[PDB]
């Protein structure tokens, strides 16, 4: 900690400073601004730069082992900083979860920019306790100076507060809103590959039909695709105009099908083929539409700006999670609910670690755009 | 006020030849595929044939194909299945359950009224 | 030629009793599986006429259920009239009708 933390933010500095100034450059060239996942990820890339700009005061503080020589002004400046960047992060994270979830299941730049001016605005408004409570503190008569977070008898449960809105507030909404939008994108993901993959195997039996001799093939591949239309006749699409023409094309389709059934098994296999050539005019009548629509969702989750947001996504809430169960712990102790000197020991010496590591988001951001480009 | 029923059971020496009647009521064959199920004696539930009588079509079991004949008169709303060279696997309890058309509910709600069964011995 | 097998020959079990009955189809059949129940000496009654979808008349404890190739059926209080034969049927098409073995419930001494 006296030394292994200091090098840790000094390679966040430098890989951030760099990586995040070419995810800036790359966006305002490259990855023009034409969407609102752009916009988005831009903010992202900024808010980034102004922690790491921040950052050095505390890899100075931490490796001096915890003295403070850069005054009181900028004691809570460099806190108030890493504050507005947790808020910031995770305000931006929920609005690229549901910017996904809309471009996907739910096929403006206005509404971006208004969003992105309403999160830089919450997320300063979220570190006001860094601006009011943070100030240089002497130990005893001792020259130590330290960064410390003080509050008066009026200003009372200010570490349970401001550990409880670290928790539910600034992680575990954020956390419970991502979870929903990336369920309902899997649940509409996996209806569209059920529809892709039946028709799928539909149309590979019809092929095995095209090329068939005998009425033994014809009549299993008939089978196969009576199977395969009926379990797509089921995944109709998430979201009168839709459930009675999809319902209807694949009624058609089946009934096409037991037509073909129908022909097969007098032994005529001609007749059988020539119904299953047909099968196909009902698809680009009834089916095609939602066809082009499944093949459409499913190739947002190839392009390479869902797979940077998931991996951002995901690792943040993943870097995260030993800061909060720590956080949490320390605001039990001081609550009294647990007096453990050995459970003590243990948050006061890990707390820097996972502070360490859950801002290491910040450095390996823009790798992601490297790693999913 | 649904119901089916049959007829036509009874010994008949093998090689033989029995005509099975379902004469039903409550509905008309040609809004439904009247199929013929038959239960040897302590076995299994076993599918011999059917007709649809909108279509004209009749299908017949591997085990049966050839040797059974299936008819169907709307008037009479009966469904006679003519029985021809009977071995002794074609001693069974014969019932005659109906099936919708498809589209629709009624073809999911596959043989829900079976008629009371016969049985026929060789 | 889609062949239905149920994994219990025979099931028994007391009155009250979770009674589940698996059958599995060797293909893919949709949800085009039925359940029935035949007392002995009587014809056979429907009792979920689709994989899962409860028919008209018949008690709400019997439950169907589709997960993939795999259908089972229970019955969650097994009443003194619920000890019967019971089969399940694929009926993809008209000509491709295969029933189940059979799983005879009795009562558990």
């Known amino acids: 900690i006296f030394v292994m933390i200091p090098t840790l933010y000094s390679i966040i500095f430098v890989v951030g400073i760099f990586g995040n100034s070419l995810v800036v450059i790359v966006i305002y060239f490259y990855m023009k601004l034409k969407t609102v996942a752009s916009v988005f990820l831009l903010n992202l890339a900024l808010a980034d730069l102004c922690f790491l700009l921040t950052l050095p005061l505390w890899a100075v503080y931490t490796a001096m082992e915890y003295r403070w020589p850069f005054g009181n002004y900028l004691c809570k400046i460099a806190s108030a900083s890493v504050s507005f960047n947790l808020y910031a992060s995770v305000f931006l994270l929920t609005c690229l979860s549901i910017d996904r979830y809309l471009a996907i299941v739910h096929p403006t730049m206005l509404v971006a920019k208004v969003t992105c001016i309403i999160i830089w605005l919450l997320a300063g408004l979220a570190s006001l306790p860094a601006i009011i409570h943070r100030n240089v503190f002497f130990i005893e008569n001792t020259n130590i100076t330290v960064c410390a977070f003080h509050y008066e008898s009026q200003n009372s449960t200010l570490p349970i507060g401001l550990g409880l809105t670290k928790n539910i507030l600034g992680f575990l909404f954020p956390f419970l809103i991502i979870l929903t939008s990336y369920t309902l994108i899997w649940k509409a993901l996996k209806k569209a590959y059920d529809l892709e993959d039946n028709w799928e195997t539909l149309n590979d039996n019809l092929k095995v039909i095209e090329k068939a001799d005998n009425a033994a093939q014809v009549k299993d591949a008939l089978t196969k695709m009576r199977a395969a239309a009926l379990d797509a006749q089921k995944a109709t699409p998430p979201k009168s105009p839709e459930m009675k023409d999809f319902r209807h094309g694949f009624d058609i389709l089946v009934g096409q099908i037991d037509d073909a059934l129908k022909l097969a098994n007098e032994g005529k296999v001609k007749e059988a083929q020539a119904a299953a050539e047909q099968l196909k005019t009902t698809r680009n009548a009834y089916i095609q539409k939602y066809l082009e629509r499944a093949r459409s969702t499913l190739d947002k989750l190839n392009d390479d700006i869902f797979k940077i947001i998931m991996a951002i996504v995901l690792f943040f809430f993943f870097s995260w999670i030993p800061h909060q169960i720590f956080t949490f712990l320390d605001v039990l102790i001081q609550l009294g609910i647990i007096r453990d000197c050995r459970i003590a020991d243990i948050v006061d010496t890990a707390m820097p670690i996972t502070i360490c590591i859950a801002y290491f988001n910040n450095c390996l951001n823009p790798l992601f755009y490297g790693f999913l480009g | 006020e649904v119901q089916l029923v049959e007829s036509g059971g009874g010994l008949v020496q093998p090689g033989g030849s029995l005509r099975l009647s379902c004469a039903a009521s409550?509905?008309?064959?040609?809004?439904?595929?009247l199929h013929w199920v038959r239960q040897a004696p302590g076995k299994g539930l076993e599918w011999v044939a059917y007709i649809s009588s909108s279509s004209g079509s009749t299908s017949y079991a591997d085990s049966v194909k050839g040797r059974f004949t299936i008819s169907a008169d709307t008037s009479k709303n009966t469904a006679y299945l003519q029985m021809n060279s009977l071995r002794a696997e074609d001693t069974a309890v014969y019932y005659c359950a109906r099936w919708g058309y498809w589209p629709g509910e009624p073809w999911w709600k596959a043989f829900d009224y079976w008629g009371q069964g016969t049985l026929v011995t060789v | 030629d889609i062949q239905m097998t149920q994994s219990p020959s025979s099931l028994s079990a007391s009155v009250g009793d979770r009674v589940t009955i698996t059958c599995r189809a060797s293909?893919?059949?949709?949800?085009?599986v039925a359940w029935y129940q035949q007392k002995p000496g009587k014809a056979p009654k429907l009792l979920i006429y689709s994989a899962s979808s409860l028919y008209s008349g018949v008690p709400s404890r019997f439950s169907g259920s589709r997960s993939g190739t795999d259908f089972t059926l229970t019955i969650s209080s097994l009443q003194p009239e619920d000890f019967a034969t019971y089969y399940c049927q694929q009926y993809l098409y008209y000509s491709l009708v295969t029933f189940g073995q059979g799983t005879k419930v009795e009562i558990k001494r």
């Open positions: 409550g509905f008309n064959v040609v809004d439904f595929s």
């Open positions: 293909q893919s059949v949709s949800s085009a």
